[PDB]
Design an enzyme around this catalytic site. Structure first.
Site, mmCIF file in Angstrom:
data_model
loop_
_atom_site.group_PDB
_atom_site.id
_atom_site.type_symbol
_atom_site.label_atom_id
_atom_site.label_comp_id
_atom_site.label_asym_id
_atom_site.label_seq_id
_atom_site.Cartn_x
_atom_site.Cartn_y
_atom_site.Cartn_z
ATOM 1 N N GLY A 120 0.806 -1.203 0.000
ATOM 2 C CA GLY A 120 0.000 0.000 0.000
ATOM 3 C C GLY A 120 0.844 1.259 0.000
ATOM 4 O O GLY A 120 2.075 1.231 0.030
ATOM 5 N N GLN A 121 0.149 2.399 -0.021
ATOM 6 C CA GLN A 121 0.840 3.681 -0.127
ATOM 7 C C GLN A 121 1.752 3.919 1.071
ATOM 8 O O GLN A 121 2.919 4.297 0.910
ATOM 9 C CB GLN A 121 -0.174 4.817 -0.265
ATOM 10 C CG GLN A 121 0.454 6.202 -0.208
ATOM 11 C CD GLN A 121 -0.562 7.315 -0.355
ATOM 12 O OE1 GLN A 121 -1.406 7.288 -1.251
ATOM 13 N NE2 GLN A 121 -0.490 8.301 0.531
ATOM 14 N N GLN A 148 5.782 4.078 0.582
ATOM 15 C CA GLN A 148 6.481 5.339 0.807
ATOM 16 C C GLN A 148 7.435 5.243 1.991
ATOM 17 O O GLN A 148 8.526 5.824 1.962
ATOM 18 C CB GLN A 148 5.472 6.470 0.993
ATOM 19 C CG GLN A 148 4.696 6.764 -0.283
ATOM 20 C CD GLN A 148 3.794 7.974 -0.174
ATOM 21 O OE1 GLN A 148 3.490 8.622 -1.176
ATOM 22 N NE2 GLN A 148 3.354 8.282 1.041
ATOM 23 N N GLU A 193 -2.797 0.060 -6.829
ATOM 24 C CA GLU A 193 -2.790 1.124 -7.820
ATOM 25 C C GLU A 193 -1.349 1.485 -8.169
ATOM 26 O O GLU A 193 -0.441 1.274 -7.358
ATOM 27 C CB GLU A 193 -3.530 2.372 -7.316
ATOM 28 C CG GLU A 193 -2.927 2.999 -6.072
ATOM 29 C CD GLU A 193 -2.933 4.511 -6.130
ATOM 30 O OE1 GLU A 193 -3.088 5.059 -7.241
ATOM 31 O OE2 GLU A 193 -2.782 5.154 -5.069
ATOM 32 N N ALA A 222 -8.017 -0.460 -3.521
ATOM 33 C CA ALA A 222 -9.054 -1.097 -2.720
ATOM 34 C C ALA A 222 -10.162 -0.141 -2.301
ATOM 35 O O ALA A 222 -11.107 -0.580 -1.635
ATOM 36 C CB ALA A 222 -8.433 -1.738 -1.476
ATOM 37 N N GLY A 264 -3.465 -1.699 2.623
ATOM 38 C CA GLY A 264 -2.600 -1.897 3.773
ATOM 39 C C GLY A 264 -3.198 -2.774 4.850
ATOM 40 O O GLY A 264 -2.455 -3.365 5.640
ATOM 41 N N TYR A 296 4.029 13.680 4.701
ATOM 42 C CA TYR A 296 4.351 12.259 4.781
ATOM 43 C C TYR A 296 5.854 12.039 4.681
ATOM 44 O O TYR A 296 6.405 11.156 5.348
ATOM 45 C CB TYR A 296 3.625 11.483 3.683
ATOM 46 C CG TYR A 296 2.165 11.217 3.965
ATOM 47 C CD1 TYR A 296 1.730 10.896 5.245
ATOM 48 C CD2 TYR A 296 1.222 11.283 2.949
ATOM 49 C CE1 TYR A 296 0.392 10.649 5.502
ATOM 50 C CE2 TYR A 296 -0.113 11.040 3.195
ATOM 51 C CZ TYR A 296 -0.525 10.724 4.471
ATOM 52 O OH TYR A 296 -1.859 10.485 4.710
ATOM 53 N N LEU A 314 18.421 -8.677 16.849
ATOM 54 C CA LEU A 314 17.043 -8.281 17.128
ATOM 55 C C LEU A 314 16.233 -9.438 17.702
ATOM 56 O O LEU A 314 15.387 -9.236 18.581
ATOM 57 C CB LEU A 314 16.387 -7.743 15.856
ATOM 58 C CG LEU A 314 14.889 -7.441 15.935
ATOM 59 C CD1 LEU A 314 14.586 -6.444 17.048
ATOM 60 C CD2 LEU A 314 14.383 -6.931 14.595
ATOM 61 N N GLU A 316 17.232 -11.660 19.667
ATOM 62 C CA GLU A 316 17.536 -11.748 21.091
ATOM 63 C C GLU A 316 16.705 -10.750 21.892
ATOM 64 O O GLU A 316 16.277 -11.049 23.014
ATOM 65 C CB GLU A 316 19.031 -11.528 21.318
ATOM 66 C CG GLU A 316 19.510 -11.875 22.712
ATOM 67 C CD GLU A 316 21.021 -11.880 22.816
ATOM 68 O OE1 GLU A 316 21.675 -12.477 21.934
ATOM 69 O OE2 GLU A 316 21.555 -11.280 23.773
HETATM 70 N N1 LIG Z 1 3.358 7.583 8.219
HETATM 71 C C1 LIG Z 1 2.796 7.519 7.015
HETATM 72 N N2 LIG Z 1 1.462 7.189 6.904
HETATM 73 C C2 LIG Z 1 0.882 7.121 5.683
HETATM 74 C C3 LIG Z 1 1.608 7.383 4.531
HETATM 75 N N3 LIG Z 1 0.776 7.239 3.473
HETATM 76 C C4 LIG Z 1 -0.450 6.893 3.930
HETATM 77 N N4 LIG Z 1 -0.397 6.829 5.298
HETATM 78 C C5 LIG Z 1 -1.486 6.467 6.215
HETATM 79 O O1 LIG Z 1 -2.186 5.376 5.657
HETATM 80 C C6 LIG Z 1 -3.560 5.457 5.958
HETATM 81 C C7 LIG Z 1 -4.355 5.167 4.692
HETATM 82 O O2 LIG Z 1 -3.872 3.981 4.102
HETATM 83 P P1 LIG Z 1 -3.089 3.968 2.695
HETATM 84 O O3 LIG Z 1 -1.743 3.299 2.823
HETATM 85 O O4 LIG Z 1 -2.931 5.379 2.183
HETATM 86 O O5 LIG Z 1 -4.089 3.158 1.721
HETATM 87 P P2 LIG Z 1 -3.612 1.913 0.812
HETATM 88 O O6 LIG Z 1 -2.717 0.971 1.579
HETATM 89 O O7 LIG Z 1 -2.920 2.423 -0.428
HETATM 90 O O8 LIG Z 1 -4.969 1.141 0.407
HETATM 91 P P3 LIG Z 1 -6.061 1.786 -0.590
HETATM 92 O O9 LIG Z 1 -7.347 2.026 0.158
HETATM 93 O O10 LIG Z 1 -6.335 0.827 -1.722
HETATM 94 O O11 LIG Z 1 -5.520 3.082 -1.139
HETATM 95 C C8 LIG Z 1 -3.821 6.849 6.501
HETATM 96 O O12 LIG Z 1 -4.181 6.732 7.858
HETATM 97 C C9 LIG Z 1 -2.501 7.582 6.375
HETATM 98 O O13 LIG Z 1 -2.222 8.335 7.528
HETATM 99 C C10 LIG Z 1 2.950 7.716 4.633
HETATM 100 O O14 LIG Z 1 3.610 7.951 3.620
HETATM 101 N N5 LIG Z 1 3.539 7.783 5.881
HETATM 102 MG MG LIG Z 2 -3.805 3.720 -2.314
#
Ligand SMILES: Nc1nc2c(ncn2[C@@H]2O[C@H](COP(=O)(O)OP(=O)(O)OP(=O)(O)O)[C@@H](O)[C@H]2O)c(=O)[nH]1
Ligand SMILES: [Mg+2]
Ligand SMILES: Nc1nc2c(ncn2[C@@H]2O[C@H](COP(=O)(O)OP(=O)(O)O)[C@@H](O)[C@H]2O)c(=O)[nH]1
Ligand SMILES: COc1cc(S(=O)(=O)Oc2ccc3[nH]c(C)cc3c2)cc(OC)c1OC
Ligand SMILES: [Ca+2]
Ligand SMILES: [Mg+2]
Lengths: 427, 440, 69
Positions: free
Chosen positions: B10-11, B15, B71, B99, B146, B224, B252, B254
């Site tokens: 996921g995003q 990232q 995506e 999703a 995610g 982010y 780790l 341990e």
């Molecule tokens: N710390 C941090 N949190 C993130 C980041 N990107 C998204 N989030 C968190 O992820 C949550 C949303 O989930 P996403 O990862 O964006 O969604 P996804 O996994 O791509 O799943 P989809 O619904 O299909 O888009 C939110 O609560 C955001 O705060 C990031 O780059 N860093």
């Molecule tokens: Mg996404």
């Protein structure tokens, strides 16, 4: 990418639909011939959501124009952006609707619905990943209200896993004196509740009030009302058309805005609403978009509770200020937000403002106060239905009193459902 | 030997994976093209950094990672970013449709179309390992991918790899930087589904990171990128023992022995220090005692909760940089007499200490100052159950009205899974209460 | 003592194999239950829509009945 298919049906749908395509083409730097004379690459990152890439860098709108008479059809083609539309997407009948819902939904539109579905099939097959459909129409006429809902059911039949979105225009005695309009809206609402995922309630009464009161227009025309609609449609589609951290699409909007499938009727809002002949700040902009006078539906949010709210700020402005102001309005008006949906207000910022504006704000709200709009239509409906006035228009097309009663009770059930969650509490 | 495969889902996972692998390259001296001049063995080797990097014949050091998202937009930035040549194209897996913030679409509807392909790529990485030790799974709780796809992947990894170790880096949802209104649903569903398939999960509360960036770095509206660069520092401290080697270095696993007293109690609380800006770090050298003391300030924790109101079951200190045991012992002695450190009666109160001599690295142009020494504390405290309580309460408010549940049922899920997931969360909260009660 | 040593390592294998088997069966059940449920919802949606077409083909049947009278 994520492509959306646009469909405009009826005189109202084709009119506001054309203005929508004019505004966004200028925002994306698209001239009436379909070429890109823009200045920023941000206008083409998500351009294929609404446009198709033809030969010679010609962006063709992914739009389908439908009507039962070629009157409104020919005026759109001869307009400013009439030559950008695909010529084969003009599907018009001849017999006309005559502001009869039964004609568009059963008699006349049915003779033309299969030919419209063929154009939809060609456009949807050309999509890499189809989001869904957005329909611009009215609930007072015949083609937009009758054939528009028939199209929705037919499209839902072949694309049941795609999002169905509508820009529905509510009838108002202050705009049109047609007597059978309360019938057409109630029959259409009975259809929109069952076969749409999200519906924008564009109330002509609210549009007329904005022009008469705020814009100080003594005699508002349809062009004055459509100027409010085009700005509203430009806003509620900004996150679709422009990039950002949101990656906005039709389904994500539906998932987070619609807690219960039937309660998918949104109350649009826009700010600022200034008149010709009059520097706006973020705190003034946020408070303005939550004001009842700025709503595109004739409903008072102080008379209900917000289930979910989506806000969009367009223009170069302090994001930290927007976060504080959006938090400020929620705290000062905590009673008007439901407590059982945590974090039910979403905010986005787009750096590209609309044409002729430095800053703007468009409001999308799922408020239980939208029942005020439905109560007005139901009141006008039962006033005529009690006397059974003008029922020969529809019974002569094949309908009976059952379908009218079913439409009335279903819309009455919709209002009581909006009241149930307005009175619901956490404890 | 002891290779570790990272999976970024996921995003949020992808990232954060960008920040972690960029930081790894800076720490190990790897250029964006994959070349490492300091590595004299070409095509392989048994060095410590090879637990995270495979080597090609051309001298390219390739991460043992897979990036998955439903995506393409987020991963396309990896494909065209600064470290594009670092990854083989097969490691970056994308779909066409995400999703839509829906666990059901991430787990069932959209996820099932790509899950086999992801496992095949993971199998390709696993076959390159002489001693595969486990997996690191980076994901968010609130996203549809995610949460939904991660849980599906975790279940499949248990089938394909048995009880082989699977560690989680989980992003705990926060309203300040939220994405969806159904995040409490996705968080509870994935926590319930993954609970028996995860050996150890490091939760990161986005609100805690957001507050730290605002407070300790004077960033009014953290991005982010700001959060991820700070998160990667915590991840780097945890994985430093695997990626480096030294006399005082403690593996780790341990630490993992001390951190997990019962299989379900595997959510350590992480604290990092020093988080300081270049302007404040100028002429300010923070000692061993100062950074160690900052580990017991709740404002420095990755998950917002009050350990003073709970009981400790483990306390591990992971130092990196200019640190010697003499300073650590003195620092720990002062803290024991001045801090609210209450242990449960069934575990020893000692602190487990590891020291990596490799100094902390910062991304050039970042907002974190480069310091001579840093420390990450991993503690197993009952207070972390406060995170579950707040999350479970947001779940209860919506599920009492069945709000948004139709979006999940429409994709094939049943109401029984929601109540089953919530009851599992209620059991977890009761388990944390039980371990904190003294013995008879 | 040698017999006990064999039993311990056999019990470890049995519980690891059982864990893999339980996960594989649980996932197979969930994916099958989800596929049946989602198909049943899409079938129900198409049933209502196809019933609407039946009502549309019937409303037109009434007008053709009265126009020739
Ligand atoms: N710390 C941090 N949190 C993130 C980041 N990107 C998204 N989030 C968190 O992820 C949550 C949303 O989930 P996403 O990862 O964006 O969604 P996804 O996994 O791509 O799943 P989809 O619904 O299909 O888009 C939110 O609560 C955001 O705060 C990031 O780059 N860093
Ligand atoms: Mg996404
Ligand atoms: N705001 C706005 N409303 C319109 C416009 N055209 C029609 N309407 C409304 O739509 C209703 C009549 O619908 P109509 O356009 O005749 O639908 P048709 O029969 O399908 O063409 C009236 O109540 C009008 O208020 C327009 O251009 N703008
Ligand atoms: C184009 O229409 C939009 C689409 C999206 S979305 O695709 O990101 O969906 C979401 C995501 C999170 C959400 N939280 C809430 C309360 C609603 C909501 C909707 C967001 C919008 O508002 C900023 C939109 O309007 C401009
Ligand atoms: Ca080597
Ligand atoms: Mg007309």
């Amino acid at each position: 990418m994520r492509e959306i298919v646009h469909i405009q049906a009826g005189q109202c749908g084709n009119q506001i639909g054309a203005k929508f395509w004019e505004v966004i083409s200028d925002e994306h730097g698209i001239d009436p011939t379909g070429s890109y004379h823009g200045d920023s690459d941000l206008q083409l990152e998500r351009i294929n959501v609404y446009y198709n890439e033809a030969t010679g860098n010609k962006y063709v709108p992914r739009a389908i124009l439908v009507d039962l008479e070629p009157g409104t059809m020919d005026s759109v083609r001869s307009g400013p952006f009439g030559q950008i539309f695909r010529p084969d997407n003009f599907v018009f009948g001849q017999s006309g609707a005559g502001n009869n819902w039964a004609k568009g939904h059963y008699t006349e539109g049915a003779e033309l619905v299969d030919s419209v579905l063929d154009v939809v099939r060609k456009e949807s097959e050309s999509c890499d990943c189809l989001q869904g459909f957005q329909l611009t129409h009215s609930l007072g006429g015949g083609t937009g209200s009758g054939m528009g809902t028939l199209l929705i059911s037919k499209i839902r039949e072949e694309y049941p896993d795609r999002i169905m979105n509508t820009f529905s225009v509510m009838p108002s005695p202050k705009v049109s004196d047609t007597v059978v309009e309360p019938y057409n809206a109630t029959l259409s609402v009975h259809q929109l509740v069952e076969n749409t995922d999200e519906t924008y309630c564009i109330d002509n009464e609210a549009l007329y009030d904005i022009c008469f009161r705020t814009l100080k227009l003594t005699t508002p025309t349809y062009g004055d009302l459509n100027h409010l609609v085009s700005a509203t449609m430009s806003g509620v589609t900004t996150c679709l058309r422009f990039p950002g951290q949101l990656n906005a699409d039709l389904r994500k909007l539906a998932v987070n805005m619609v807690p219960f499938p039937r309660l998918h009727f949104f109350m649009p809002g826009f700010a600022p609403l200034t008149s010709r002949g009059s520097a706006l700040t973020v705190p003034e902009l946020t408070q303005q978009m939550f004001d009842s006078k700025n709503m595109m539906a004739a409903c008072d949010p102080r008379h209900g509770r917000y289930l979910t709210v989506a806000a969009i700020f367009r223009g170069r402005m302090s994001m930290k200020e927007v976060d504080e102001q959006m938090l400020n309005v929620q705290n000062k008006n905590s009673s008007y937000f439901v407590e059982w949906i945590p974090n039910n207000v979403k905010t986005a910022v787009c750096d590209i403002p609309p044409r002729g504006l430095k800053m703007s704000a468009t409001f999308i709200g799922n408020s239980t106060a939208i029942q005020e709009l439905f109560k007005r239509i139901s009141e006008q409906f039962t006033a005529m239905f009690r006397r059974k006035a003008f029922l020969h228009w529809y019974t002569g097309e094949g309908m009976d009193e059952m379908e009218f009663t079913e439409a009335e009770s279903n819309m009455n059930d919709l209002v009581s459902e909006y009241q149930q969650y307005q009175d619901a509490t956490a404890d | 030997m002891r290779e570790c495969i990272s999976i970024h889902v996921g995003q949020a996972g992808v990232q954060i994976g960008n920040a972690c692998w960029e930081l790894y390259c800076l720490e190990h001296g790897i250029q964006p093209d994959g070349q490492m001049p300091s590595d004299k063995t070409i095509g392989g080797g048994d060095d410590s950094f090879n637990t995270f990097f495979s080597e090609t014949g051309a001298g390219k050091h390739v991460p043992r990672a897979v990036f998955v998202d439903l995506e393409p937009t987020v991963i396309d930035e990896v494909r065209t970013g600064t470290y594009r040549q670092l990854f083989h194209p097969e490691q970056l897996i994308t779909g066409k449709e995400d999703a839509a913030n829906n666990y059901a679409r991430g787990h069932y509807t959209i996820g099932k179309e790509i899950i086999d392909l992801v496992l095949d790529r993971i199998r390709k990485l696993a076959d390159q390992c002489t001693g595969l030790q486990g997996f690191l799974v980076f994901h968010s709780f609130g996203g549809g991918t995610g949460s939904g796809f991660t849980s599906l992947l975790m279940e499949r990894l248990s089938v394909d790899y048995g009880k082989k170790s699977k560690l989680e880096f989980s992003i705990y949802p926060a309203p300040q930087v939220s994405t969806a209104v159904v995040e409490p649903y996705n968080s509870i569903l994935t926590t319930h589904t993954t609970l028996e398939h995860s050996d150890c999960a490091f939760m990161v509360d986005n609100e805690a990171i957001y507050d730290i960036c605002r407070r300790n770095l004077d960033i009014e509206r953290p991005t982010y990128t700001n959060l991820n660069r700070l998160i990667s520092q915590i991840v780097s401290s945890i994985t430093a023992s695997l990626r480096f080697d030294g006399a005082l270095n403690v593996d780790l696993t341990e630490f993992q022995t001390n951190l997990v007293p019962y299989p379900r109690i595997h959510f350590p609380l992480a604290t990092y220090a020093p988080v300081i800006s270049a302007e404040k770090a100028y002429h300010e050298q923070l000692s061993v005692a100062e950074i160690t003391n900052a580990c017991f300030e709740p404002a420095n924790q990755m998950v917002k909760c009050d350990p003073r109101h709970g009981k400790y079951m483990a306390c591990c200190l992971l130092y990196r940089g200019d640190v010697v045991p003499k300073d650590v012992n003195a620092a720990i002695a002062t803290i024991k007499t001045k801090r609210s450190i209450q242990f449960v009666d069934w575990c020893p109160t000692g602190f487990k200490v590891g020291i990596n001599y490799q100094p902390p690295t910062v991304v050039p142009g970042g907002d974190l100052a480069k310091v001579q020494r840093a420390v990450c504390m991993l503690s197993n405290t009952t207070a972390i159950a406060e995170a579950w309580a707040r999350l479970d309460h947001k779940f209860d408010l919506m599920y009492a009205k069945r709000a948004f549940v139709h979006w999940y049922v429409g994709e094939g899920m049943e109401e029984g899974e929601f109540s089953e997931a919530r009851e599992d969360m209620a059991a977890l909260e009761k388990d944390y209460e039980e371990v904190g009660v003294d013995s008879v | 003592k040698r017999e006990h040593e064999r039993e311990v390592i056999q019990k470890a294998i049995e519980e690891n194999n059982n864990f893999i088997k339980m996960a594989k069966e649980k996932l197979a059940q969930k994916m099958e239950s989800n596929k049946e449920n989602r198909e049943a919802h899409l079938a129900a949606m198409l049933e209502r829509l196809q019933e609407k077409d039946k009502h549309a083909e019937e409303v037109r049947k009434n007008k053709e009945l009265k126009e020739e009278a």
